[PDB]
Design a protein around this ligand. Structure first.
Ligand SMILES: Nc1nc2c(ncn2[C@@H]2O[C@H](COP(=O)(O)OP(=O)(O)O)[C@@H](OP(=O)(O)OP(=O)(O)O)[C@H]2O)c(=O)[nH]1
Ligand SMILES: Nc1nc2c(ncn2[C@@H]2O[C@H](COP(=O)(O)OP(=O)(O)O)[C@@H](OP(=O)(O)OP(=O)(O)O)[C@H]2O)c(=O)[nH]1
Ligand SMILES: [Mg+2]
Ligand SMILES: [Mg+2]
Ligand SMILES: [Mg+2]
Ligand SMILES: [Mg+2]
Lengths: 176, 176
């Protein structure tokens, strides 16, 4: 249950945004050598982006876990799978971190801080949807940032969460 | 350029097959604890499958490389990213390997042989499309196998390779 407005996007809607996102990246003048998709949400955006950028997709995954510190239980982000070690072919290369939604930036900050420990040239970040809202996380300095589209602070319903894709598509069209 | 018949599938076409594939898996009676997606082709099928199976997606990636052995250059499959080491939470668990197409089975055999070196309970494999054709690779004994649909030996055009998704969808409908 959510209390804000809601929006549904078709697979094709998202594919079209990814094509435009690839063009934004290409126009910034840094040629990326590989993507690092943050699963699970970044996997589909990253493989769609590969259609247009034609660079390999490496993968990490994060998740929130119940953390009990100082007499208070809150959710914190942790690694589920990581690039340990980073392969030698990526040393000194440009890598593009890919995720589906910029909501709180807590995962994004965690992953970017960890990847800046490595021997990359340029680390950039590309997200499908950028929500306009307050952010708990911060993007480190010097990291190029791209979003496919900016969105209101609405709950986004992704087609890859649709038990009934026909009903999902109906709600997507009923929102246009 | 290909010399066989060709088919185009929409994103929604594939989503519907994945829903049916999840039902085939559920009916076989083994509860899988995690997926291992083989990138890049397995990423989108695996995240679609997560909608219905609700288990985490781990990732490996393979690619073909030019291999020069005994005075003859052929393409061979190699690791690009692997699960090194397998996390302890997966020890003794059931893992479902996910890929998009069963064509030659050379990648599938390579990955399954490598994953059988680990301490899993059940290793199963799920593929979106199973092509009916001769196979160079072999599936090890005792590995449950599921395919979403079986297909003729045709070239499959995936929507995540469509530079123009509208033209892609036109060709998909023109094939029904
Ligand atoms: N459907 C949907 N999900 C939203 C929306 N806003 C945030 N989320 C989910 O919230 C989770 C936490 O995201 P954040 O930590 O805020 O991500 P950020 O750094 O990229 O801004 C993400 O899942 P996660 O914990 O990273 O899991 P996974 O699904 O990526 O594996 C993301 O998918 C929204 O509008 N719609
Ligand atoms: N579009 C399309 N591709 C096909 C088709 N048949 C085979 N392929 C591609 O051939 C490559 C080699 O596949 P195999 O090694 O035969 O796969 P298998 O073991 O699962 O049968 C795969 O890409 P890869 O080298 O594994 O790369 P990636 O794209 O998965 O990263 C796969 O996507 C088809 O009908 N259509
Ligand atoms: Mg995520
Ligand atoms: Mg490390
Ligand atoms: Mg593959
Ligand atoms: Mg190993």
């Amino acid at each position: 249950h959510h209390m804000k407005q809601k929006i549904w996007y078709t697979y094709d809607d998202i594919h079209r945004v990814i094509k435009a996102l690839a063009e934004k990246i290409r126009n910034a003048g840094v040629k990326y050598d590989a993507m690092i998709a943050i699963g699970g949400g970044g996997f589909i955006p990253a493989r769609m982006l590969r259609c247009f950028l034609e660079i390999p997709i490496y993968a990490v995954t994060t998740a929130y876990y119940d953390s009990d510190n100082e007499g208070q239980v809150t959710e914190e982000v942790k690694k589920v799978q990581w690039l340990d070690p980073v392969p030698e072919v990526l040393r000194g290369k440009n890598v593009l971190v890919v995720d589906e939604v910029d909501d709180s930036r807590v995962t994004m900050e965690f992953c970017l801080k960890e990847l800046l420990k490595e021997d990359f040239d340029t680390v950039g970040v590309a997200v499908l949807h950028e929500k306009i809202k307050a952010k708990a996380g911060k993007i480190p300095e010097g990291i190029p940032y791209f979003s496919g589209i900016t969105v209101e602070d609405w709950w986004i319903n992704y087609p890859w969460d649709a038990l009934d894709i026909d009903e999902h598509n109906r709600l997507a069209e009923a929102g246009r």
